[PDB]
Amino acid sequence: NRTLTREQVLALAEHIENAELNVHDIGKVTNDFPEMTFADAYDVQWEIRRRKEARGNKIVGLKMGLTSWAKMAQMGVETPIYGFLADYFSVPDGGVVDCSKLIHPKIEAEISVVTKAPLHGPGCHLGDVIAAIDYVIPTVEVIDSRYENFKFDPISVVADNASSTRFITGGRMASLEEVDLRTLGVVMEKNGEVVELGAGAAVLGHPLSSVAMLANLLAERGEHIPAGTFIMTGGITAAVPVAPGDNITVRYQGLGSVSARFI
Ligand SMILES: O=C(O)CCC(=O)C(=O)O
Numbered sequence: 001n002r003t004l005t006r007e008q009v010l011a012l013a014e015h016i017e018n019a020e021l022n023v024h025d026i027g028k029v030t031n032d033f034p035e036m037t038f039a040d041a042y043d044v045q046w047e048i049r050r051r052k053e054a055r056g057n058k059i060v061g062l063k064m065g066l067t068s069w070a071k072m073a074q075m076g077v078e079t080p081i082y083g084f085l086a087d088y089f090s091v092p093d094g095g096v097v098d099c100s101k102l103i104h105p106k107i108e109a110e111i112s113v114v115t116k117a118p119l120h121g122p123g124c125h126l127g128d129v130i131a132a133i134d135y136v137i138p139t140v141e142v143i144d145s146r147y148e149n150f151k152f153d154p155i156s157v158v159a160d161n162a163s164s165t166r167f168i169t170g171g172r173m174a175s176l177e178e179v180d181l182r183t184l185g186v187v188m189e190k191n192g193e194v195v196e197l198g199a200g201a202a203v204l205g206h207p208l209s210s211v212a213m214l215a216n217l218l219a220e221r222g223e224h225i226p227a228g229t230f231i232m233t234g235g236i237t238a239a240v241p242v243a244p245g246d247n248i249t250v251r252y253q254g255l256g257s258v259s260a261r262f263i
């Protein structure tokens with residue numbers, strides 16, 4: 001399942017994290033370790049998590065990447081990917097993101113869930129997830145691949161924590177009974193203009209499925225989704241570059257809006 005030595009995992013994690021911490025893009029790691037499997041990549045990502053926990057960061061949630069059947073097929077993968085969210089990733093609705101701490105950030109409109117019951121795989125699917133949802137909450141992610149490379153590389157991206165870097169919760173919380181996630185419309189505005197549109201169904205056909213896929217992915221490593229877990233279910237719209245001076249508002253049908261100022 002794995003081709004990296006443990007020393008390589010540790011060194012890769014340090015190297016990839018350092019790119020984030022030092023705001024310094026690096027070559028995608030699969031160029032130097034072309035044999036890396038997803039298990040290697042997750043070993044690396046999880047070691048990054050450890051490095052963050054070790055210096056006292058709290059891990060406050062999980063995020064999903066590649067939550068598009070089309071994109072999965074394009075990238076030659078059969079499942080989404082996930083990454084973790086550190087406490088300092090969090091930005092208040094309307095808050096400021098300091099781009100000088102970021103490399104080449106993009107924002108995406110997502111819907112997050114907080115669970116109220118444990119979920120696990122393998123074999124988790126939508127039906128298992130429904131009963132476990134406490135509420136949903138509009139969330140914009142700021143993603144920022146630490147790689148200098150143009151073309152998306154799933155295994156490198158995983159090693160780089162699915163490009164996670166900031167997330168902004170906002171809008172209004174709602175129970176599942178109050179929202180239809182498949183038809184929940186989102187409008188992303190940047191500097192006063194509509195730049196992207198999407199509906200919840202853009203996430204796998206049903207954003208809650210993202211949670212189940214997460215459960216099954218975590219099961220591959222003998223982990224699950226504890227109750228109370230905050231999960232960003234995936235990009236509803238295309239990701240949009242942001243730069244200093246940009247202001248963005250993402251409007252969620254019936255859920256208010258999430259905004260952020262970039263400096
Ligand atoms: O580009 C993708 O869909 C996966 C990587 C990512 O950063 C994300 O979607 O959160």
Ligand SMILES: [Cl-]
Binds near residue numbers: 096097098099101
């Ligand atoms: Cl910041």
Ligand SMILES: [Mg+2]
Binds near residue numbers: 065
């Ligand atoms: Mg995302």
